[PDB]
Amino acid sequence: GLDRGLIAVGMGLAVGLAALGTGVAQARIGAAGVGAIAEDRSNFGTALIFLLLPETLVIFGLLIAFILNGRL
Amino acid sequence: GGLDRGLIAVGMGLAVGLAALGTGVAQARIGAAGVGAIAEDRSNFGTALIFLLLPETLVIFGLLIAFILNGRL
Amino acid sequence: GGLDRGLIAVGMGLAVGLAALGTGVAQARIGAAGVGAIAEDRSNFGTALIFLLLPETLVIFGLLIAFILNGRL
Amino acid sequence: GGLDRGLIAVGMGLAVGLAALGTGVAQARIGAAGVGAIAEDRSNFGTALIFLLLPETLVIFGLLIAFILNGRL
Amino acid sequence: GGLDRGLIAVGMGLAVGLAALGTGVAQARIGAAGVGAIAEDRSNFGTALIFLLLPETLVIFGLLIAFILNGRL
Amino acid sequence: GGLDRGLIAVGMGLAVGLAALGTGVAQARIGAAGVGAIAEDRSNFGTALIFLLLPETLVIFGLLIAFILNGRL
Amino acid sequence: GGLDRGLIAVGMGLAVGLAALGTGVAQARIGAAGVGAIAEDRSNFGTALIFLLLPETLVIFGLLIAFILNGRL
Amino acid sequence: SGGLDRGLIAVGMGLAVGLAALGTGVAQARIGAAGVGAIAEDRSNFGTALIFLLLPETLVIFGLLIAFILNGRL
Amino acid sequence: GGLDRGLIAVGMGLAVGLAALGTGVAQARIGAAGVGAIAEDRSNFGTALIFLLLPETLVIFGLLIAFILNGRL
Amino acid sequence: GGLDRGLIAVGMGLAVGLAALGTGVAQARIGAAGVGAIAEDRSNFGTALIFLLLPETLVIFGLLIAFILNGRL
Amino acid sequence: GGLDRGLIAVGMGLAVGLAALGTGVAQARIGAAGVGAIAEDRSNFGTALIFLLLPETLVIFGLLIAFILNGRL
Amino acid sequence: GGLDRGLIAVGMGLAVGLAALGTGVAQARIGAAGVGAIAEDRSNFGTALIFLLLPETLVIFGLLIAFILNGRL
Amino acid sequence: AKPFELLVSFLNTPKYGTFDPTPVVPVFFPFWFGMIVGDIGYALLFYLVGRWLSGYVKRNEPLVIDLFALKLKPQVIGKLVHILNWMVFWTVVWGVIYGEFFGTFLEHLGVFGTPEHPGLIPILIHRIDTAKTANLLILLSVAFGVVLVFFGLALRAYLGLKHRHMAHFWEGVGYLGGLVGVLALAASYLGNLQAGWLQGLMYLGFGVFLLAVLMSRIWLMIPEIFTQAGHILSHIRIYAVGAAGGILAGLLTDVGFALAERLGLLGVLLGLLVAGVLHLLILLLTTLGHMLQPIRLLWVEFFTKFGFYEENG
Fold this sequence. Notes:
The complex is a hetero-oligomer of 13 chains, with twelve copies of chain A and one copy of chain M. Helices cover about 80% and strands about 0% of the residues of chain A. Chain A is built from four helices and no strands. Chain A has a single domain, classed as F1F0 ATP synthase subunit C (F1FO ATP Synthase), CATH 1.20.20. In chain M, strand 1 and strand 2 form a beta hairpin. Chain M is flat. At the J-L interface, helix 1, helix 2, helix 3 and helix 4 of J face helix 1 and helix 4 of L. Chains B, C, D, E, F, G, I, J, K, L: This is V-type ATP synthase, subunit K. Chains B, C, D, E, F, G, I, J, K, L: It is a multi-pass membrane protein. Chains B, C, D, E, F, G, I, J, K, L: It comes from Thermus thermophilus (strain ATCC 27634 / DSM 579 / HB8). Chains B, C, D, E, F, G, I, J, K, L: Keywords: Ion transport, Membrane, Signal, Transmembrane, Transmembrane helix, Transport.
């Protein structure tokens, strides 16, 4: 059963590339958020709205990695 | 040699990861809507988030094209 | 058997993946450009979405390239 | 023979996807730069569409080289 | 036996390294604006630190898969 | 015989796609300048189109070498 | 057989290398911001140091996984 | 072909020509943008921009010819 | 004698030179600001040069793991 | 012939191609700066021509190595 | 396994290869600022070039690893 | 000597190619600043040229390793 | 010798008391140029161009190039012609040294003397052999750089001898000691591994090098020693370019031969014209850089390095 190792490398690269995807989107939004908080500290809730939208992308990869584990 | 599953699963893994990277690079530069909203008109939040909610259609596309690969087994 | 056909999932998956990231790169820049129009004018909003929803012919083409080899499977 | 009949379809993914992100970055810069004219004039929509709809020739090449030998098997 | 034990290790290592560099990329650009904000006043210290504690979720997500995998080993 | 068709296939595919990517990344930069150039007058229209015309020669070479190596089959 | 004991060696390697690269790209921007801000005011040397001494913490996981992976021999 | 020599040399040729083409395009990008910016008033001397854009063409040809000849002589 | 004894060597560079990439990209951003600070004022030589070296903690880890993996030979 | 005689060829190709990459990336910035300098003082054309092609040596090493490797045929 | 001493060659070359640009990226950004500094004060060449010699130190690691790997055969 | 010579061969080209890239990445940014300095003042050819010749100290590597290992083979 | 002084004069003026470097170039540069010159058939066209410019000279043409809007000075061009005489000479003799030219009939009959074909027309280099031709290609370009850099460091040391900046005279011979030590170590490593006098040479080399360090801890001098120790190895680029040009010309001539004969009766009358067109266009593209490469090598590695960073008047 050598495919039992190929599933591991596949899920690892999947979750890693998902981490790259969610880790690159913070560029403009972080600067915008800190600039708005410096502009107005009352903008906590509005700022934190944007900072959670791309972070859900990792969920799909970890779900598919988890469900492909059970194929063994 | 009956190996079929793993060399499917590696492609299954990389497809959704590349799609996630695409959505990330899409979402990266569109953050100017937030500062464009709060600094000028906070009421434009919907007109901002409509652009936020569109690009993630491609990972939704990538979900089923990876799911069908497991269904072959 | 198995090894003769399991490799195809890599080829279509990579294709749809980097097509997705290419269209994400396109969408990011054009959306970052497109926000300024609606930010300063609510009227030209309509043409902007027409300009935003152009770069999708490549991903459906990748879908078809996946589907032909799925049929060949 | 062997899995060489499956190895031929691997190049289809590269051929599609590389032209895909090529046009991705192409219209990424062009259409984002193109909206300056529509920000000031409705009439210049045609020429801007001419700029952003010229360079797609690369993906047709990937399509035709996909069709040129997929029928070998 | 054999020819199985290295694959799990290299996959886990690739996953965790990619997650770590993604966290680094996320922190890099926000750090400069945090430096500017704390250079404005000491009062921005906590409100700048609250942003940097967010992306570490990726690393703890990556590493947990190694434990179950080498427990399977 | 017939055990290496996939290798020449993927080689020509990567060649033509990589040439396409190079042409696209050149086209993005040249079109960004050209669309701003047309914003002043129509007199620069034809004189700008030649600059975007020239990098198309690169994919011609890849298509030529692929097609002449398609004749190996 | 027995080459799995050699195949695990790269697994530590790419992980620690990618972690180091992510660390470095994290330190780059924050250190540039710190040295730029500290020139106009040296009183904030402690705050700048305790700020930019932060994303290097991901390295401790790379050595941890390195020691627990090669310890399996 | 006991070994898969034709594919082995073909992938190397493809890598060579693709990387050469992308490097030439990367070189051409900035110089073309700057030349287009220059010729907004340099119709008197656009030929300098023409010859400066012409010179990176020499980068493709040697890789192209070596890729051609490493297979064409066998 | 298995293939592992020669397989050990390939893992070293992927760690050490990639950490070298991280250190170089870290040094590049801070060096310009540092030399600017020195040009405007030589008195800041110490408080700048203390930041000129620090990312090389990564490369000593890389050499450490590289040699300690070579010890298994 | 043999498998090595084909396997040798990939190293030469990647070497010369990525050397061409280095020459092009070196060429772009210096050429753009040179034509920026020549735009308002045309007399300095006989000066910039030295610098704008000086790094051409890079590909020459690659083709030298290529002639060495094909000499082992 | 007589192929063990065959793949020791690629590790040395890859190591020195990625270490090369990992070095070069530092001089890339520091040199422009250094020659900007020398453009207005000609006594600053000594304090500039010392920065240009800092990133040269770590190229030695790949070649010494290569030599000690050559000590096996 | 069996079918191994291609493995030794491919590692040579990667080193010299990436050395060329490391030279070019520095050369691109340094040359633009140097020619910008020399455009406004004729009195700086030597100080610019000595710094432009500095990155050429990197390309000397890789090739000598290739020679000595080919002689070893 | 006097015409060559123009090229140096573009740079900063020397200081009186420093020796004139102009007589170095006219003997060393032209035969370095000769190594790109398997192309000898097309350098007769360069001779024709020189004849054309001499016709301008006897006309005393104040030429203006419409493309670059540059002004030409008639008295300068005669210096250029007398310079080009020697490189045309080195052109001819180096193309003879190659031995191989396009009229080689070995593709059809064994007329030219080679190891493959023991003919009556001996050709020294067939450009196919790679066993000893490679080593002979390396060796001379290795030796030339070593001789010239030793001469440069020796004359810089003798300039340091006169004025009391003689503190850097010691480091000048320290460079020599370091170079001979590393050369001995390198030659002992890949060579036939005899090491006795090699050990003595490296011992004396790093000993006399470390003697110069005891003068003063100069923080700046210690890393750049490795840099010029690669600049000496940078001299190997000379034969690389020449081999690139020569093998390209040879393969293009073989393409002309193939289109002539290997196409059968249909291709007999066609291939030579397009082969010549390709040759002339690639020469037009390449010869400018190939000309400027050796002159800039000697111009920056020897001429600028020994004495042309300092004062001027």
